[PDB]
Specification:
Chains A, B: Homotetramer. Interacts with TRPM1; the interaction results in the formation of a heteromultimeric cation channel complex that are functionally different from the homomeric channels. Chains A, B: It is found in: Cell membrane. Chains A, B: Belongs to the transient receptor (TC 1.A.4) family. LTrpC subfamily. TRPM3 sub-subfamily. This is part of a larger assembly, with two copies of chain A (about 35 residues). By secondary structure, chain A is mainly α. Chain A is built from one helix and no strands. Chain A has one helix at about 5-30. The longest helix of chain A has 24 residues, at about 5-30. The N and C termini of chain A lie far apart (about 50 Å). The interface between A and B is medium-sized, with 14 and 15 residues.
């Protein structure tokens, strides 16, 4: 019940979005062509 | 009506965010240069 609440889903989504954006910024900053 | 509630949208967004984050981490890990 705890793992499927709205607040937990919003929190985990925010954390993973932040991490994914940071990784994508690193990938884009490292172009070679 | 069921497909357009807030909880369903949050759940779908969370699932796709997790999947996309895993895929982007896999792509970033595999680099040829």
């Amino acid at each position: 019940r705890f793992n499927s609440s709205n607040d937990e889903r919003i929190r985990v989504t925010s954390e993973r979005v932040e991490n994914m954006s940071m990784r994508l910024e690193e990938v884009n900053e490292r172009e070679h062509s």
